Chain A
Amino acid sequence: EEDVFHPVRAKQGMVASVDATATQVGVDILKEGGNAVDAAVAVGYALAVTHPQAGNLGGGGFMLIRSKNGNTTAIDFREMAPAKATRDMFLDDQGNPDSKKSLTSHLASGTPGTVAGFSLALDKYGTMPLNKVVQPAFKLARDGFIVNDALADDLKTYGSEVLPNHENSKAIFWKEGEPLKKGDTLVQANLAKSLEMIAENGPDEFYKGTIAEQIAQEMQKNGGLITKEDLAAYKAVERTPISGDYRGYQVYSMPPPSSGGIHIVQILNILENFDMKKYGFGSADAMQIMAEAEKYAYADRSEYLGDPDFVKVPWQALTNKAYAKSIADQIDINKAKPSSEIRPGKLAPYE
């Protein structure tokens, strides 16, 4: 009764996502007997259809899995730069980065890993076949769904900047010269065909089949770099999670190629040295301490983080409590330190 905000409650299973339709797809899978991984893959495919803003088959991401028995693991299905990519590929003739090239051109794309990631997880930790978890998404693509406020707003705002500039994109997301409006039905026949082939041929359809061919051609015809060799060489990777201990609670998150786990643990390590509970939420003291701690972590991020398969990341030093303590001792609760006075930390004494 003292609570202003109440959580949704359930006794058996639960799914939380950015889209109602996708969430319901996941719940149905659980009700059908699928485990968390089965449901997660189903939701992932469903969002690839109902949330084109971010849900996808053409991107990548990370998955954290923790079994009922405590086994915790991470699935890295981050995109890989094409084999033809070069260090200075985004610099103009003057040597200055061109944001247009890295955000809106065909050179902005990395080799997609979502399909590979979901299959690696499903095959090892799931219980259902790919065709069964892809079916819900397939139906949504084939039969369509109603455009809601979220999708309509995104199409009008972010979509207007890029979707109408490409013929194939415009044919799907635009209508009568304008972005699809709330209430309109969005049918994605081509995506439905892609989903249908993945369900029947497996992930190879994406990395070596018809889909791969379509991606390679899109690239070759428009100055892009992703080739069939790139797609055929892509692999999702299971890695050990980065973890820490905060006041007796264990925190597990993503390891490199993500900087998330390392810095969340680093910052918590720093905060552990202060009585946060005493200051309380929304207090200037609590915010001051955290803002300061965050500066050091982001400074370290700019120097030490990258793909672990190409560079050695000093994750042990970065998540070392003694190192965190040395940072905590520098924080003045009454005076912020300018970023110009903060540089990446010296990790030698902690490694």
Chain B
Amino acid sequence: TTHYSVVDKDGNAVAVTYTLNTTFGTGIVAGESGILLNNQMDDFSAKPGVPNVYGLVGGDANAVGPNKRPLSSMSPTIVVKDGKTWLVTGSPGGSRIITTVLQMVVNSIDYGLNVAEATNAPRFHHQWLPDELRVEKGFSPDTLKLLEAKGQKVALKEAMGSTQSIMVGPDGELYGASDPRSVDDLTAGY
């Protein structure tokens, strides 16, 4: 999965998140087309109560069915401030997309972090099942100690996401940031 954002000179904005699901999808090219095929079907609930590759579960609502679109977690998002497009963001991450984008929004609104600061900040995540508070490296040992005291089951795991965001200044100027978690990416303009 990958996400990208765009804002033009007139102020129009677009946020796109698209994917093959897992990296390279099935890894199957369609004949001589040179096109890789997705493995999006794993996003359906194969059986009620049994988790898919991202630990997500379902029932009747997200059951496999003909011509049905499997439930996604993709969240291209736009935040509006004072009636104007302010933050354009999104990210890959399967079940973690929801919490990653959420943190971008909270970091921007509640903590007043500029787009780069919000992007480089560490992330945490809890998806109900499994019952664990997943964290990235970067949180204070003092803070993690307090969380464990509160009853959270902290699990240090792999870095989450790849936000590619743009913030629109009050005067219309643009500010952008690419995720430190992904190399060879780029935010550029003119």
**Interface CB pairs A-B, < 8 A, 12:** A7-B116, A18-B178, A19-B185, A53-B20, A55-B2, A61-B18, A79-B69, A85-B65, A210-B33, A218-B30, A250-B80, A339-B128
CB distance from B133 to the nearest CB of A (A): 5
CA distance A260 to B105 in the complex (A): 13
Are B12 and A264 neighbours in the complex by a CB distance under 8 Å? no
* Known A84-B66, A253-B75, A253-B101; contact A62-B174, beta-carbon cutoff 8 A: no
CB distance from B44 to the nearest CB of A (A): 7
* Closest partner residue, chain B, to A47 (CB atom): B2
CA distance A54 to B111 in the complex (A): 32
CA distance A211 to B166 in the complex (A): 35
Task: Identify which of B2, B143, B151 gathers the most chain A CB atoms within 10 Å of its CB.
Answer: B2
Interface range for B: 35 or more
Per-residue contact bits, chain A 19-45, to B (CB 8 Å; 1 contact, 0 not): 110111011001100111101100110
CB distance from B52 to the nearest CB of A (A): 7
CA distance A10 to B174 in the complex (A): 5
Are A26 and B6 neighbours in the complex by a CB distance under 8 Å? yes
Are A214 and B30 neighbours in the complex by a CB distance under 8 Å? yes
Are B38 and A110 neighbours in the complex by a CB distance under 8 Å? yes
Does any Cβ of A come within 8 Å of B102's Cβ? yes
A283-311 interface (Cβ within 8 A of B)? 283-284, 287-288, 290-292, 294-299, 301-307, 309-311
Are A306 and B71 neighbours in the complex by a CB distance under 8 Å? yes
Are B38 and A60 neighbours in the complex by a CB distance under 8 Å? yes
Interface size of A in residues (CB-CB distance below 8 Å): 173
Are B75 and A260 neighbours in the complex by a CB distance under 8 Å? yes
Are A68 and B23 neighbours in the complex by a CB distance under 8 Å? no
* Known A79-B70, A254-B76; contact A17-B139, beta-carbon cutoff 8 A: no
Contact of A14 among B64, B112, B189 (CB under 8 A): B189
CB distance from B34 to the nearest CB of A (A): 3
Inter-chain contacts of A96 with B (CB < 8 A): 47, 50
CA distance A77 to B16 in the complex (A): 11
Are B19 and A60 neighbours in the complex by a CB distance under 8 Å? yes
Inter-chain contacts of A154 with B (CB < 8 A): 23-24
CA distance A158 to B66 in the complex (A): 29
Are B71 and A257 neighbours in the complex by a CB distance under 8 Å? yes
Inter-chain contacts of B79 with A (CB < 8 A): 249-252
A69-121 interface (Cβ within 8 A of B)? 70, 72, 76-91, 95-97, 99, 102-110, 112, 114, 117
Contact of B58 among A31, A192, A263, A302 (CB under 8 A): A302
